């Protein structure tokens, strides 16, 4: 029975605490936050064994097998390292690190300490994204993939820390692009990136990028687009399309739930937009891949089943983003090494 600690009792600590509490092979043992009242509230809401106010004590406790780190991006590296050095398995929310060297250091650490290190690429475990991938891999029907495009857009993160470079490590390219890049590479069966090209925008007034376009060229000829935004009103969008020589596949997460509703006022449990025509969500957590993700991690820890989607995939995506940031700066298409293609 895998004894789990949640580190950061905010929004994603809550999502993970829910899926942990529901999983028969695990126990929600502890919740820790710098804000001890936020840890207590979440420990209560999901019936955790306890609130643990001390990081040091949490790490020394031999009753904890796995920590889930849901703190602000810029803390991920230090927290995960300390955790792995203390002997704990770790699931870290994306971004696993804020630079490829941060990520590489964690992977090497996890290997040295013989620990499972997993990162929070949940969409890659979304049942509807899994399906879409089988369809593209059905060569008879789809043929050879030549385009993949993944779009993540919303009206921007609300938490104050996501506005500072030291706490967030980057703007929209890092926050949403990490996911878009992973989904492109993974929809094409782990395709190798040969070049990266990107351009960033600052749409909101005075500074982190709040919208970006990043494009990858892959070994086989295919081209991937990642189009991400913190400045799109009207409801979060997560879509993908893949186009091959013979077929097409389209995926829609938030307006492909098969529910529509209309009201003047606004429905009680309905997000944003509030009023008028909306697309209410059912089982958003599962549809988004969190149950399957966390389940994989609980199994990897509980019985050394290797992860299907490892942290090496986080290194590859970190390299892509870092190169995207450079491509924007230099206004050219770059190899992952940083060299210009020409």
């Amino acid at each position: 029975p895998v004894r789990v600690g949640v580190v950061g009792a905010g929004f994603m600590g809550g999502v993970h605490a829910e899926v942990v509490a529901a999983h028969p092979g695990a126990r929600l043992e502890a919740v820790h936050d710098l804000d001890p009242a936020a840890a207590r509230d979440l420990a209560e809401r999901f019936r955790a064994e306890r609130a643990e106010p001390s990081w040091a004590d949490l790490l020394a406790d031999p009753a904890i097998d796995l920590l889930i780190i849901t703190t602000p991006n810029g803390l991920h590296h230090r927290q995960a390292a300390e955790a792995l050095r203390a002997g704990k398995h770790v699931l870290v929310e994306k971004p696993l690190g804020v630079t490829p060297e941060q990520v590489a250091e964690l992977v090497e650490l996890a290997g040295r300490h013989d620990r499972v290190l997993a990162h929070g690429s949940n969409f890659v475990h979304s049942p509807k994204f899994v399906r879409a991938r089988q369809l593209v891999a059905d060569t008879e029907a789809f043929g050879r993939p030549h385009l993949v495009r993944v779009v993540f857009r919303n009206s921007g993160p609300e938490a104050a820390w996501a506005a500072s470079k030291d706490l967030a490590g980057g703007g929209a390219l890092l926050d949403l692009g990490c996911h878009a890049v992973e989904l492109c590479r993974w929809l094409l069966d782990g395709a190798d990136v040969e070049s990266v090209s990107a351009r960033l925008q600052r749409v909101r007034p005075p500074a982190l990028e709040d919208q970006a376009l990043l494009v990858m060229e892959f070994a086989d000829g295919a081209v991937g687009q990642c189009d991400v935004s913190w400045v799109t009103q009207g409801g979060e969008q997560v879509t993908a399309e893949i186009i091959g020589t013979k077929g097409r596949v389209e995926v829609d997460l938030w307006t492909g739930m098969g529910l529509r509703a209309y009201s003047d006022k606004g429905y009680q449990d309905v997000w944003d937009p509030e009023q008028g025509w909306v697309h209410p969500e059912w089982e958003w957590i599962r549809a988004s891949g969190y149950y399957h993700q966390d389940g994989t991690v609980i199994e990897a820890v509980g019985q050394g089943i290797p992860l299907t989607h490892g942290p090496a995939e986080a290194l590859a995506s970190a390299r892509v983003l870092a190169t995207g940031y450079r491509s924007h700066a230099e206004g050219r298409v770059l190899r992952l090494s940083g060299a210009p293609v020409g």
Copy 2:
């Protein structure tokens, strides 16, 4: 740990076998079919303790707690009765019985032997339908519901038994209408039916009805339509809509998965239509309510949690359909008692 037997190893025996194998609080203990090879196929597919070729032996086995009956409609009554008499809890695929009196007999019989009896109204446990019901029940936004329409259409059941009245008990109204009626009533929080009106069609050549429209009037003023069909090409359709004084809600099961795909050939695990633009399914079983339904039944048996959706609801729907059949015959709007309005 609830020990489960599946009776009828065809399409729905397969669906229930999968959800049973996946449920931690249960064990797929046996599979039985008149065709012992089909039972063995399925027992293997889902790692059942055994294939049980003998109905008698299956019923006497004190290791089974619950049977799930996925045989042709006309057998449901006898099989469920024998099962309850043998001390087993029972989940019966819809229709629970072929007439209200068959259903009432089983409920009473389950009472006598102190057994859980459940019926396979899966859509009422569909996470997306549960959500749609909360939105309708959100009075400030939805206002008062005044219309509900549920549409079930497909190109018709392929099995030969579903073409015979003796084995099927009825045509599309009984087959698909039972679901549509339960969803209308349940979307409106168990609304009381005041009248029923229906017309049936025979579209494909010489005979059971192929297509039907059934309309309920409810106590509060709302009207429910159930529009069902065995003669609709182009992919199964399961949709609902609810309209209130202030809102609307629309529910779409099979073309509201957020996946589209195109090919000339046809994709390996994609149903019907085969070719051209299709809407592939993800997690169809869960989306359709089977995991939550069976879960409820496993919990009712395992730890005496009462069912949220009991077999009395199958009685209410059976009465509705029976009155719909009579409405069609007499060409008039009837009370459940059978009297004309």
Copy 3:
């Protein structure tokens, strides 16, 4: 050059005045209203030769060839009769009459006076509805039609006269059902109705019906549903579906324009709903059939081209509705004669 008079300078007088002013084979000659200022305003907005304040003078004027009657339903019969007796051709907005006998009287009148009588069934001239009909008539692909359903729903007519039985002649079944019935019969190539069954509701508090369902059985075996409503919020809906032994055809007028837009505030030229996700309209008048309709009528008058969709179709639909009203009262399925089927 067909010289046209518009009678009733309200909403539909405005729609018709627009299409008349645009048509090269016609001239918007006069506009008449009991409210002479409403006639003047419309005469100006569309450059009519004049505002004609006198009905009698309008009818005696030998310079007018065709009157378009866009007054309240309950005036249609008397106005159209007087017009035809005076020697004028007439297009009457639906409902052409409020009972089958009103309609029959007008048809007989039009024949006696050798005049074109047309009624305002515009959807039957909607280019997208025309297409849908060819697809159903493509027997190879569609097979034999066995179901047709037409849905008209909105939040109800705003004009005061539509709330009185004397001025409106009926509630939603008459107002919206007339159109739904015509589209069902016409989508199936003028199919003969054998039985009618209907039920009406009064949803709004205290009285005319504000929602209805009417079902027709046709000669060939097919069944038609007309589902109409004055109590559906969230935007007007006009849809149809047809299902055959081999095929299906679906038509959507107001959410099948291929435009979507989102705003918090509301866009300047956008209807209802105002805010949030909307489906703005482009060329709604043409998409709805009014240009083609009126064009047919202008040609029938201008050069005795017979109407493709005649007033006999209004008699057939009037009979259907009248029988629907009776079916509701008696709670049974009736033949057009009024007899019960049994």
Copy 4:
């Protein structure tokens, strides 16, 4: 009454012949093709005064006011120049020329002979695109536009000339991108392009580009994407999206007609895909802007109303594409001048 000659009696000569025949202020006077039988087919189809087998005779005929040029891209320049020199007004299908200098030469040449020169940017006259532009321009609701994306994809041009560089002048970027670029600029009210960046692909075997992505940066901060493809099965796609600080607008031409149909066979007048679920078209020609475009040109010629969308816009787009081609070669983001950013 504007007397019109159509030059090139293939697919677009057919489209323009239909809108010309239907326009009251014009007459379809002649149709000319290298294939005199194709010219005659079309002259008959649309009741043209005559089939004119001779280019020279067509140009000398003082009865023609306007020629519409619907020949292969590489001929546009020579044909339009000869036509303007012969005193005729000219509407040239896109691309107006194959290089910015070809386009600039024609504009200047039209000026010299005091002639209307128009190019076939039809989507910019599409009633639905015109509407989408008003919504974006509605500042209180939309706020400031910061993204525009236009997508044009199909399974590729079938004619052999469109596979040759000499006859086509370029691959998918020139063919489909010209439209996508004009729509981005025009949706943002004639926005000034500050930079261009593009990458091209060759998807189908050995060669002109099959698929491309071109991205503009605009003066105000907004970014435009043009995503074009000859290698997309499953039906032509023409869509756009615009996103502002407060709103979004989405435009869909071919799957936003409000018609769906299913058959196994295929419906008589339905394009591609043939079978299964399709989106049949109604009034495609009007929806695509051809009636309004040609109307504008007929009015410009007939009664000296200036064009709303002039050939200078074809120069701006030609510069963009030429810089996109260079961007792809050099693998960097370029100013229109050709300089790197």
